[PDB]
């Protein structure tokens, strides 16, 4: 008698013990009120959401939702062990375009990136990965840089984080520490598996709905070609059966690669940083962050105004400050292009002040 | 107090009620032994398995496993969207190659193919669809024919089926009726969501592991261009696990089986008289007679491999010394042709004496 009850109790004990070590709570059920609060919070403009869709690859971008891949058609994995064949032998192992203000987050199963002979176990506070990842902006593209770990490069240790369940929304929250160039980062977790949106019918009960990626196609192409740019981590979610757990490796954009800015462009234009009050001549994370922040201070100044255009970049907008006399050029796609101080006593500066043509 | 307990009880009531209408049982938990029993049944040679991976597209083939796609990267969704538009106006609306004996099963969400503004409701015993699909063999390809329904082609009604839980394995079973040309068809259902195989570690509990598709890339390409329809709808739990989703499932035409295709049987039916078939009309019934007669030849104990057909490199010829018939099988296993040897003719005498057909 009760063989089924015994098996269920045994499953429940094993699940509770695994979840405890992994920092995992089973998804809740959602009242109407909860689901509304959860949907409000995930639809904020700067929200980054992880879905607990098991065994999935995800790419999230602020303002445009989450792209999900699951199944064998998630052979995207193999660019992630081709790389892992390649560390046998240059710290940048591989750059992968994902497609053509703005933050981004890429995540996939951590176990497929684990070290030689390694099984990642719940309870660990860090995991040594032979390859770490970083999202960057490379010439219009969102790209993933795969970096060989070791010593002379970037450490192998990746921190394991635990999410906090918000009892008001039924969502989870992971928080990343502040770094040079960026405040603490909140990442939302939708604990309900959601490979796509359920149709809003009587066949489903209320759940939060993660905004789904729309717009440009996500497609991985290998592109021809420091540790402060790394905000990557591992967290645990329930497995597909829902009774065990799986580790997920998560990678965020470099603080300096944000759509409006890229480290590449800041470096290219650092020659102008003296016009924004920066004396440093060395180019490093610290001074490029100074330059990025100086451009943001110029654009945020209440007396900075849109004034004219930069002929060479069709549809660019120029933002002028009448006190510092600085201009900053923004391309039509929103990318920072360049900036410098206007000389009002020179021909070209006089033409700009008079006509707006920079 | 107990606000969470009340919400959970209400969720459980709603789930049981929806599951009841849909014929759905929640997945079980598995002892080690149940998992081994389930894995043994799914590895039987002719097994066709559906996975209850929610909101997924799947392609299953005997002996090669299940291919799964879920997420946005289910873009072939729009294949079925495009035809649902093309239906405003030819019965055949599209033919989709899936890539280059052997049976096959293709499944996706049934709401994708319902009418616009149509919601499929649990409890229905059939569903009227504006398209139905058929799996075929077209020129080495496994392909999907999407057919407009209506008076002018094929009916719209698709049966809704319920799966039976096997308490010994923890798997479900769906059965399709026998038809002209095929016996009853057993379809296994792995009720545990499984977009891919869990790595066998201490982080997972025992569950049935469905064999996964290896081999040829599964890619969808449009191709230039009835008792062949064994399609149905069944329900599985949704991604949250607390509601249900309808799945539309299509099997291969009984005459399209890798070894045979309706197209090749039609092409070679001129030889059916050598296999004892007097009918001159070509239809499902007589093409099935021909298919069955070729199978009777290949199954005959006296039939032996003998020589080759050089015109098709690597082919094998199967000869029966009582009927004097030959059947030619291509190296990929496709039936090519067959006919009766005339031993008093030059080429028949050459074949008997040298194996050169």
Does A13 reach chain B within 8 Å, measured CB to CB?
no
Does A201 reach chain B within 8 Å, measured CB to CB?
yes
Does A88 reach chain B within 8 Å, measured CB to CB?
no
Interatomic CA distance for residues B317 and B300, integer angstroms = 14
Sheet with B56-61, edge to edge strand ranges = A233-238, A245-252, A104-109, A56-61, A65-71, B65-71, B56-61, B104-109, B244-251, B231-237
CB B253 within 8 A of CB B135: yes
CB atoms within 10 A of CB B350: 12
The sign of the dihedral angle between the CA atoms of B275, B276, B281, B283 is negative
Interatomic CA distance for residues B70 and A58, integer angstroms = 12
Does A181 reach chain B within 8 Å, measured CB to CB?
no
For B55, the token pair is 């909101």
Does A31 reach chain B within 8 Å, measured CB to CB?
yes
For A193, the token pair is 């598996």
For B228, the token pair is 């062949």
**Resolution reading in Å:** 1.9
What is the distance in angstroms between the Cα of A320 and the nearest Cα belonging to chain B?
A: 42
Residue of B nearest to A29 (CA): B8
Nearest to B119 among A18, A31, A201 (CB): A201
Beta bridge partners of B108: B248
DSSP A28-63: ----HHHHHHHHHHHTSTT--EEE--TTEEEEEETT
Nearest to B11 among A11, A111, A205 (CB): A205
Nearest to A204 among B195, B212, B243 (CB): B243
What is the distance in angstroms between the Cα of B125 and the nearest Cα belonging to chain A?
A: 16
Interatomic CA distance for residues B200 and A258, integer angstroms = 39
Interatomic CA distance for residues A343 and A335, integer angstroms = 24
Does B129 reach chain A within 8 Å, measured CB to CB?
no
The sign of the dihedral angle between the CA atoms of A282, A283, A287, A290 is positive
Residues on chain A touching B71 (C-beta within 8 angstroms): 53, 56, 67-71, 74, 195-196
Q: How far is CA A107 from CA A56, A57, A233, A254, in A?
A: 8, 6, 10, 15
User: Torsion angle, CA of B9/B12/B13/B16, rounded to 10 degrees?
Assistant: -160
Nearest to B69 by CA among B191, B196, B235, B188: B196
CA A1, distance to chain mean position in Å, is 52
Residue of B nearest to A239 (CA): B204
For A269, the token pair is 């234009």
Does A241 reach chain B within 8 Å, measured CB to CB?
yes
Does B215 reach chain A within 8 Å, measured CB to CB?
no
Strand, coil or helix: B233: strand
DSSP A151-202: SSSS-SEEEB--PEE-TTTS-EEEEEPPBTTB--EEEEEE-S--SSPPPSST
**CA–CA–CA angle A306, A311, A314 (5° rounding):** 85
Interatomic CA distance for residues A268 and B192, integer angstroms = 53
Nearest to B245 by CA among B53, B83, B67: B53
Nearest to B70 among A70, A202, A242 (CB): A70
* H or E element at residue A293: helix A285-300
Interatomic CA distance for residues B235 and B19, integer angstroms = 9
Quote the DSSP letter at residue B3.
Answer: H
Query: b/e per residue, A20-53, with b = 16+ CB within 10 A?
Result: eebbbeebbbbbeebbebbbebbeeeebbbbbbb
Residues on chain A touching B28 (C-beta within 8 angstroms): 4
DSSP B243-266: SEEEEEEEEB-TT-SSS--HHHHH
Nearest to A71 among B69, B119, B207 (CB): B69
Phi-psi region of B79 (alpha: psi -120 to 50; beta: other; left: phi over 0): alpha
What is the distance in angstroms between the Cα of A99 and the nearest Cα belonging to chain B?
A: 14
Does B14 reach chain A within 8 Å, measured CB to CB?
yes
The sign of the dihedral angle between the CA atoms of B2, B5, B11, B13 is negative
Phi, psi for A104 (deg, rounded to 5): -145, 155
Please compute Rg for chain A using Cα positions.
24
DSSP B5-69: HHHHHHHHHHHHHHHHHHT--PPPP--HHHHHHHHHHHTSTT--EEE--TTEEEEEETTTEEEEE
CB atoms within 10 A of CB A267: 15
Residues on chain B touching A114 (C-beta within 8 angstroms): none
Phi, psi for B166 (deg, rounded to 5): -85, 110
Q: How far is CA A220 from CA A48, A95, B69, in A?
A: 21, 10, 17
Interatomic CA distance for residues A93 and A105, integer angstroms = 20
Q: Decide if B239 and A195 are in contact by the 8 Å CB cutoff.
A: yes
Please compute Rg for chain B using Cα positions.
24
Alpha carbon distance, N-terminus to C-terminus of chain B: 86
Residues ≥6 apart with Cβ < 8 Å to B8: A29
Interatomic CA distance for residues B140 and A340, integer angstroms = 64
Which of A:295-324 have CB within 8 Å of B? none
Q: Decide if B54 and A193 are in contact by the 8 Å CB cutoff.
A: yes
Residue indicated by tokens 């000869």: B319
Does A192 reach chain B within 8 Å, measured CB to CB?
yes
Phi, psi for A235 (deg, rounded to 5): -135, 165
Does A144 reach chain B within 8 Å, measured CB to CB?
no
Q: Decide if B204 and A243 are in contact by the 8 Å CB cutoff.
A: yes
Interatomic CA distance for residues B170 and B187, integer angstroms = 14
Does A279 reach chain B within 8 Å, measured CB to CB?
no
For an interface test with A, the pick among B54, B73, B200, B245 (most A C-beta atoms closer than 10 Å) comes out as B73
Interatomic CA distance for residues A148 and A83, integer angstroms = 9
Interatomic CA distance for residues A264 and A274, integer angstroms = 18
Interatomic CA distance for residues A76 and A97, integer angstroms = 12
Interatomic CA distance for residues B71 and A99, integer angstroms = 17
CB A129 within 8 A of CB A100: no
Nearest to B244 among A14, A203, A242 (CB): A203
CB atoms within 10 A of CB B313: 9
For B148, the token pair is 């407009």
Interatomic CA distance for residues A87 and A129, integer angstroms = 11
Interatomic CA distance for residues A51 and A140, integer angstroms = 27
For B83, the token pair is 């035809």
3-state per-residue secondary structure call for A113-141: HCCCCCCCCCCCCEEECCEEEEEEEECCE
Interatomic CA distance for residues B42 and B189, integer angstroms = 9
Residues ≥6 apart with Cβ < 8 Å to A155: A149, A227
Characterize the bridge pairing of strands B316-319 and B304-305.
Answer: antiparallel
Does A82 reach chain B within 8 Å, measured CB to CB?
no
Interatomic CA distance for residues A233 and A248, integer angstroms = 8
Q: Decide if B122 and A203 are in contact by the 8 Å CB cutoff.
A: yes
Phi, psi for A108 (deg, rounded to 5): -160, 170
Counting beta carbons within 10 angstroms of the beta carbon of residue B28, is it exposed (0 to 12), middle (13 to 18) or buried (19 or more)? buried
Interatomic CA distance for residues B232 and B175, integer angstroms = 10
Quote the DSSP letter at residue A223.
Answer: P
Nearest to A246 by CA among A68, A87, A119: A119
For B8, the token pair is 């959970």
* H or E element at residue B105: strand B104-109
Q: Decide if A244 and B205 are in contact by the 8 Å CB cutoff.
A: yes
Residue of A nearest to B69 (CA): A71
Long-range contacts of range B150-158, CB-CB < 8 Å, 24 or more positions apart? B152/B91, B153/B91, B154/B91, B154/B226, B154/B229, B156/B128, B156/B129, B156/B130, B156/B132, B157/B126, B157/B127, B157/B128, B158/B126, B158/B127, B158/B128, B158/B129, B158/B132, B158/B231, B158/B232, B158/B233, B158/B248
Residue indicated by tokens 């939708």: A190
CATH number of A263-355: 3.10.450.200
Does B243 reach chain A within 8 Å, measured CB to CB?
yes
CATH number of B262-354: 3.10.450.200
Strand, coil or helix: B285: helix
CA A99, distance to chain mean position in Å, is 14
* H or E element at residue A68: strand A65-71
Interatomic CA distance for residues A331 and B194, integer angstroms = 46
CB A146 within 8 A of CB A93: yes
- Name the maximum alpha-carbon separation found in chain A: 97
Residues ≥6 apart with Cβ < 8 Å to A89: none
- HSE, CB side, 13 Å, CA atoms: give it for residue A68: 28
Characterize the bridge pairing of strands A185-190 and A49-51.
Answer: parallel
The sign of the dihedral angle between the CA atoms of A14, A20, A23, A29 is positive
Nearest to B72 among A4, A213, A242 (CB): A213
CB B171 within 8 A of CB B188: yes
Counting beta carbons within 10 angstroms of the beta carbon of residue A224, is it exposed (0 to 12), middle (13 to 18) or buried (19 or more)? exposed
Residue of B nearest to A26 (CA): B240
The sign of the dihedral angle between the CA atoms of A209, A211, A217, A220 is negative
CB B277 within 8 A of CB B289: yes
Residue indicated by tokens 């201009």: A327
Residue indicated by tokens 């015109």: B311
Residues on chain B touching A73 (C-beta within 8 angstroms): 67-69, 73-74, 218
Strand, coil or helix: A263: helix
């Amino acid at each position: 008698m009760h063989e089924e009850a015994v098996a269920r109790a045994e499953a429940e004990k094993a699940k509770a013990e695994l979840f405890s070590k992994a920092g995992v709570n089973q998804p809740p059920v959602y009242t109407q009120e909860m689901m509304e609060r959860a949907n409000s919070v995930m639809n904020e403009q700067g929200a980054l959401v992880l879905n607990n869709t098991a065994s999935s690859v995800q790419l999230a971008m602020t303002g445009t939702g989450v792209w999900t891949a699951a199944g064998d058609i998630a052979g995207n994995i193999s660019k992630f062990f081709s790389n892992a064949l390649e560390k046998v032998t240059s710290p940048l192992l591989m750059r992968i375009s994902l497609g053509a203000n703005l933050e981004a987050m890429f995540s996939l199963s951590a176990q497929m990136l684990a070290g030689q002979g390694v099984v990642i176990e719940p309870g660990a506070t860090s995991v040594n990965l032979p390859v770490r990842g970083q999202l960057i902006n490379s010439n219009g593209q969102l790209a993933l840089d795969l970096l060989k770990t070791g010593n002379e490069s970037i450490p192998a240790a990746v921190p394991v984080l635990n999410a906090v369940r918000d009892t008001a929304t039924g969502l989870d929250k992971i928080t990343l520490p502040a770094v040079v160039g960026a405040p603490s980062r909140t990442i939302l977790v939708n604990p309900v598996p959601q490979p796509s949106v359920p149709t809003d019918t009587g066949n489903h009960q209320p759940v939060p709905v993660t905004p789904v990626h729309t717009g440009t196609e996500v497609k991985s192409v290998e592109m021809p070609v420091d540790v402060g740019g790394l905000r990557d981590f591992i967290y645990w979610r329930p497995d597909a059966a829902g009774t065990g757990v799986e580790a997920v490796y998560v990678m965020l954009n470099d603080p300096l690669d944000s759509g409006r800015f890229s480290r590449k462009q800041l470096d290219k234009k650092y020659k102008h940083a003296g016009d924004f009050g920066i004396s440093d001549t060395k180019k490093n994370r610290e001074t490029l962050t100074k330059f990025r922040d100086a451009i943001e201070e110029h654009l945020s100044d209440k007396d900075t105004v849109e004034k004219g255009t930069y002929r060479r970049e069709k549809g660019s907008k120029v933002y002028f400050n009448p006190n510092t006399m600085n201009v900053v050029i923004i391309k039509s796609n929103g990318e920072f292009l360049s900036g410098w101080k206007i000389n009002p006593d020179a021909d070209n500066g006089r033409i700009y002040l008079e006509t707006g043509e920079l």
